Design an enzyme around this catalytic site. Structure first.
Site: not given
Ligand SMILES: Nc1ncnc2c1ncn2[C@@H]1O[C@H](COP(=O)(O)OP(=O)(O)OP(=O)(O)OP(=O)(O)OP(=O)(O)OC[C@H]2O[C@@H](n3cnc4c(N)ncnc43)[C@H](O)[C@@H]2O)[C@@H](O)[C@H]1O
Ligand SMILES: [Mg+2]
Ligand SMILES: [Zn+2]
Length: 216
Positions: A13, A88, A127, A160, A171
């Site tokens: 994302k 989500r 990552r 992270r 997660r």
């Molecule tokens: N095409 C490709 N091929 C190969 N490799 C690739 C690739 N594209 C990318 N990559 C690589 O893959 C890796 C990942 O890519 P990356 O782009 O970093 O992935 P992401 O989908 O953005 O991953 P996140 O870990 O950031 O998502 P998340 O939903 O788990 O947590 P979030 O921060 O939103 O949220 C964290 C916490 O916040 C809370 N939270 C957030 N939103 C809510 C909500 N709406 N409601 C309740 N709790 C919430 C929760 O407690 C949660 O645990 C990287 O190393 C990248 O380089």
């Molecule tokens: Mg992210």
């Protein structure tokens, strides 16, 4: 151009979104980043969210929806926005519908980034993130030119805290069980779009950008 980005933990994302915000100029609104940014500054929000984030669990709906409602009302969301990680849960999705109905900015497309759950642990544990701009890298799939530092600004990279095996697992677990209901909710709405997120980063973007023409 009002978009929602959804996908299991590590689906890509942020990588996707970075792109989109550079090409279209719509704000990138990541609830994860916002919560992160709060935990960093030790704001009351940050402290309450920390409990859930560190455990890989979802932060309660009430407080989350509240910060998203305020953000979307910002001057920078005038021509659109890019929601990342919200909603989500179906309840957040329903809550979002009213907020947008209030702002008069209905969702154009919900882009689901499909990546098989059995490869996300590898994406997350490998990552590395820039402590300066937040851009992400991956030791194997998209490593920095010089190991340990960001290509763009030369800042140190980190891992992270929730990207450890135990928390990644929780997660994936927590989000996987919320996924089908969300897909159903938006499929019924008529603006759900599925993209194969298991290809080179410029290939996934290519597909995405081809759903963005005509959106103002
Ligand atoms: N095409 C490709 N091929 C190969 N490799 C690739 C690739 N594209 C990318 N990559 C690589 O893959 C890796 C990942 O890519 P990356 O782009 O970093 O992935 P992401 O989908 O953005 O991953 P996140 O870990 O950031 O998502 P998340 O939903 O788990 O947590 P979030 O921060 O939103 O949220 C964290 C916490 O916040 C809370 N939270 C957030 N939103 C809510 C909500 N709406 N409601 C309740 N709790 C919430 C929760 O407690 C949660 O645990 C990287 O190393 C990248 O380089
Ligand atoms: Mg992210
Ligand atoms: Zn950087």
């Amino acid at each position: 151009m009002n978009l929602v980005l959804m996908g299991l933990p590590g689906a890509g994302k942020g990588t996707l979104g970075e792109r989109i915000v550079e090409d279209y100029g719509i704000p990138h609104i990541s609830t994860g980043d916002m919560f992160r940014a709060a935990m960093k500054e030790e704001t009351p929000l940050g402290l309450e969210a920390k409990s859930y984030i560190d455990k890989g669990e979802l932060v309660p709906d009430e407080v989350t929806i509240g910060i998203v409602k305020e953000r979307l009302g910002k001057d920078d969301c005038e021509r659109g926005f890019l929601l990342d990680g919200f909603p989500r849960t179906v309840a957040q999705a329903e809550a979002l519908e009213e907020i947008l109905e209030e702002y008069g900015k209905p969702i154009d497309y919900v882009i689901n980034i499909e990546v098989d759950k059995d490869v996300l642990m590898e994406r997350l544990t490998g990552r590395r993130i820039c402590s300066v701009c937040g851009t992400t890298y991956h030791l194997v799939f998209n490593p920095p030119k010089t190991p340990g530092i960001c290509d763009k600004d030369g800042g140190e990279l980190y891992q992270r805290a929730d990207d450890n095996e135990e928390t990644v697992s929780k997660r994936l677990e927590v989000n996987m069980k919320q996924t089908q209901p969300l897909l159903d909710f938006y499929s019924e709405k008529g603006y759900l779009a599925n993209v194969n997120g298991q290809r080179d980063i410029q290939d996934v973007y290519a597909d995405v950008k081809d759903l963005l023409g005509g959106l103002k």
